Amino acid sequence: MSMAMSQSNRELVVDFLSYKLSQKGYSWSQFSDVEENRTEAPEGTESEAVKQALREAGDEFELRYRRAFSDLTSQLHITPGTAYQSFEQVVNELFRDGVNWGRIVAFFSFGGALCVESVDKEMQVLVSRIAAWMATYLNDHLEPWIQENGGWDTFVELYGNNAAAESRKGQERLEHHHHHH
Numbered sequence: 555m556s557m558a559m560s561q562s563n564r565e566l567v568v569d570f571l572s573y574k575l576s577q578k579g580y581s582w583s584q585f586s587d588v589e590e591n592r593t594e595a596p597e598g599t600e601s602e603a604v605k606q607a608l609r610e611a612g613d614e615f616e617l618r619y620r621r622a623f624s625d626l627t628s629q630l631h632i633t634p635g636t637a638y639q640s641f642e643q644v645v646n647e648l649f650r651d652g653v654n655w656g657r658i659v660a661f662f663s664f665g666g667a668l669c670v671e672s673v674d675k676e677m678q679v680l681v682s683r684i685a686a687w688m689a690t691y692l693n694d695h696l697e698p699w700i701q702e703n704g705g706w707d708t709f710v711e712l713y714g715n716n717a718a719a720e721s722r723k724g725q726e727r728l729e730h731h732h733h734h735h
């Protein structure tokens with residue numbers, strides 16, 4: 555069978571996380587140490603598309619929304635006290651109007667943003683904790699909706715273009731016929 559969503563959540567936040575960490579030079583394998591097998595050329599499949607959309611989303615979403623969670627992040631001060639309580643409290647606030655594809659892109663970049671920042675200073679020990687909270691939220695606190703709408707394949711085929719348009723141009727005045735009369 556396909557048995558999707560079998561384990562594309564725990565390593566979903568870590569995959570995008572490293573994508574933003576390597577940009578700063580923090581890496582991830584060195585975050586909490588842990589033995590390092592190797593992974594030279596295992597291949598396996600590496601044919602995931604969600605990581606692609608979530609990638610551009612972190613950029614596109616960070617343009618039209620000059621102010622998205624400017625208050626949410628400010629309400630997540632990192633410290634030896636809160637963690638999943640305040641994180642879920644402000645996070646649930648995002649998944650309240652209605653679980654949507656964009657909402658899933660905002661909660662994703664929002665989490666990686668908390669790790670890239672906590673690690674940007676000198677705290678690479680609470681990265682698995684934050685990434686874990688987002689991993690569980692997607693494990694069974696959102697998946698049921700990801701498929702009810704269509705599934706990750708839709709989250710990309712719907713917005714994440716994949717050379718499927720086969721139109722190239724598309725402009726032509728305004729890709730429309732001014733139906734508004």
Ligand SMILES: O=C(NS(=O)(=O)c1ccc(NCCSc2ccccc2)c([N+](=O)[O-])c1)c1ccc(-c2ccc(F)cc2)cc1
Pocket residue numbers: 611614615618619621622623624626648654655656657659660713
């Ligand atoms: O528009 C939203 N969701 S959506 O209507 O379902 C949508 C719309 C367009 C795109 N993409 C095309 C335009 S770019 C974009 C991408 C992600 C988020 C926003 C824009 C995507 N998406 O890619 O996931 C998703 C959306 C808008 C605002 C918020 C939001 C909620 C609370 C906040 F504090 C800040 C922002 C959360 C989601």
